Design a binder for this molecule. Structure first.
Ligand code: NI
Ligand code: NI
Lengths: 183, 183
């Protein structure tokens, strides 16, 4: 099996979003399944935080908030893209080889900037596309894989994917405050 | 067995902090073990965020930041205390029965305020004390328990403890920005 969205939370407006069910979906082994639930919840809460945002506020900053909502959304997707390289391809990321991801990763300070800045819809599409790739690969792996060190070292697979989730939540806390300042 | 701190990350300055090892500690069943690792990592990162903070900044606010660092640290501990009630005792929390926790939970707006505000050391002691109680109880439970609905309903045990971790990380993102504004 592959990821079936109907077996996971699709909205925060349901009791499903408040259950972590590691065996919900036969596409995933148990620890991987638990990660999928957590990643799903983190993404639903990121999207709720920016839902309805006036588009003229997307790149706005404020005192104490050096990174705009758009910058943070680019960053969240880019961290996932970076971990596809570290976790799935097994190599370190560089600005040479991974320029777009590196730009997102570094809040636009390094790497390769896009030709024009993305719209909010494009940012959400890139978030979804990154996540689709994660879930594709997760369906191919098992919990023994999750215990392995990363190819480039210094962490294990379980931590790496936890970190993708945790960093999203970290920046979503920031997004909540910035939106409130701007709006 | 009960929680042995030597079997878990004790510092962010070690490769141990970047491994999630659900079977590290015989005190815990696998999904519970994974939560413990995640909760541990979240707490280490909260403490790093406030380490060395000048104490005169503890209750300071700034434009866009209605909740001070002290308020957020009180909140993080209080959410854990609230979940001890919901998860372990099996009842809803009220301002009548859980006044101190309710004050932390609500950023000081409801509930029962302390006689005087805590110092940074006291805030960290309360964080540690709350966590000790969590780990005590986790050693008594198994993964079947983690799948159960909460007694007061609306979530499962697995989600509840995930949420304690995730909300900490959310507010730690806020703490990072506030400290940078003040300092
Ligand atoms: Ni980040
Ligand atoms: Ni909170």
């Amino acid at each position: 099996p592959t990821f079936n969205p109907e077996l996971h939370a699709q909205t925060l407006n349901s009791e499903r979003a408040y259950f972590v069910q590691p065996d919900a979906d036969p596409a995933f082994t148990p620890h991987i399944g638990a990660l999928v639930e957590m990643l799903t919840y983190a993404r639903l809460t990121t999207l709720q935080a920016v839902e309805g945002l006036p588009e003229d506020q997307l790149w706005a900053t404020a005192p104490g908030f050096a990174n705009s909502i758009g910058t943070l959304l680019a960053h969240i997707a880019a961290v996932e893209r970076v971990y596809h390289v570290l976790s799935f391809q097994g190599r370190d990321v560089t600005p040479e080889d991974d320029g777009a991801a590196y730009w997102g990763l570094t809040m636009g300070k390094e790497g390769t900037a896009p030709a024009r800045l993305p719209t909010l819809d494009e940012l959400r599409a890139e978030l979804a596309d990154a996540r689709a790739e994660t879930l594709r690969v997760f369906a191919a792996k098992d919990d023994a894989w999750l215990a392995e060190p990363l190819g480039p070292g210094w962490a294990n697979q379980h931590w790496a994917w936890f970190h993708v989730m945790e960093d999203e939540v970290n920046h979503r806390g920031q997004l909540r405050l910035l939106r409130q300042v701007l709006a």
